[PDB]
């Protein structure tokens, strides 16, 4: 039992309506947009395979010369209403936007630095326009914010002298100033998702992370803050030295989701995964043939996976320099939206069902105790195994899309075969189960 001033604050999951909304949303989109979209992974003739948003680093570009990319920031095809229509049609209930990435360029007209949209040919407050457009479509907006900033000389990677400490202190002042600014210009913000918080400097300043969390919660009622922000008194990040989760939800699982058999611990807190369509490209990269690019079904599989274990999933997009989306991303959003329109009752506002994982796919649980079977892998046996928790029985099964009744055969105490539909749906599909919890056997139902 280690005593701590800047360790965890929340007892269990938050159950206030704004957290319920953050959670019930389930499906988000990420936007990574900034100066990196101009060179798109290429610099001085060399195409770099690393993440396009890190190209300043891959190509060893000095800050002064990286930031002169602002002179070419002119996204004439940008239209925030079109971006919000795209998100709505994909079935997202929220969008997270890079307000400022590591390069330090701000997508709003910050009064605290010259490296902003204000000082580009385009001049306009892109951040404000997107906030309005998404909110007009009924889509919540979350702000990604990089603490690490390659544009501000005051930033330190570690505190190695009194000078470093004085310097980093003003940098933290500067960071609070931008945070207050985003919270006061854009009060409909629902979440701040921090990044670039892993350096020794930040870990040494745990108190500052707790302060930022508190500051923003005073400024924006109900606002959510990701675990990635937080370091405790010992420099321990995400979960404090007593294993307790800091911030409002766990953020991680980029490129590997929690294991549905081994990582059931995650159902005990709120959490959010974010993913890329290629293997590791968040900002726009001009050449997607360099790594594996996920198909719509592989993405939909990850989204349902997340919801089945009590978490959110956010699919990333890296808009072109011009303010439009490349065709792969338009195809992806469309394909996702088509499936979500059909099967979304087993994703939106669903949660962990407390059933043993089976091979055919994933269970999710609705707000009224519906139990959905989302089938990704069709058994040649024509039978979907359903093993129930103690005291739970399956009274009915129904194909979601048509309401057709589906046979359920009991095979042992607590196990059934649910038949596959008479006609193969030809895509990942949903069977809704009606279940009954027996009088006073303890269970989550």
Author numbering: 35 to 479
Please give the exact wording used by the authors of the publication that reports this structure:
GH29 α-l-fucosidases catalyze the hydrolysis of terminal α-l-fucosidic linkages. GH29 α-l-fucosidases process their substrate with overall retention of configuration at the anomeric center of the cleaved fucopyranose and do so through a double-displacement mechanism. In this mechanism, first proposed by Koshland,, SN2 displacement of the aglycon (activated through protonation by the general acid/base residue) by nucleophilic attack of the catalytic nucleophile yields a fucosyl-enzyme intermediate, which is subsequently hydrolyzed to yield α-l-fucopyranose together with the released aglycon. Crystallographic analysis on bacterial α-l-fucosidase confirms that the ABPs act by covalent modification of the active site nucleophile.
The crystal structures of α-l-fucosidase from Bacteroides thetaiotaomicron in complex with compound 4 and 5 provide strong evidence for the covalent binding of cyclophellitol aziridine to active α-l-fucosidases and by this virtue the validity of the cyclophellitol aziridine design for activity-based profiling of retaining glycosidases that employ the Koshland double displacement mechanism. “Aglycon” here reflects the aziridine N-acyl moiety to which the BODIPY tags are grafted in ABPs 1 and 2 and which is designed to occupy the space normally occupied by the substrate fucoside. The 3-D fold of BtFuc2970, however, appears not to provide sufficient space to accommodate an extended aryl aglycon pendant to the atom, which would equate to the ring oxygen in fucose. N-Benzoyl aziridine 4, bearing a bulky aromatic N-benzoate group, is about eight-fold less active compared to its N-acetylated counterpart, 5.
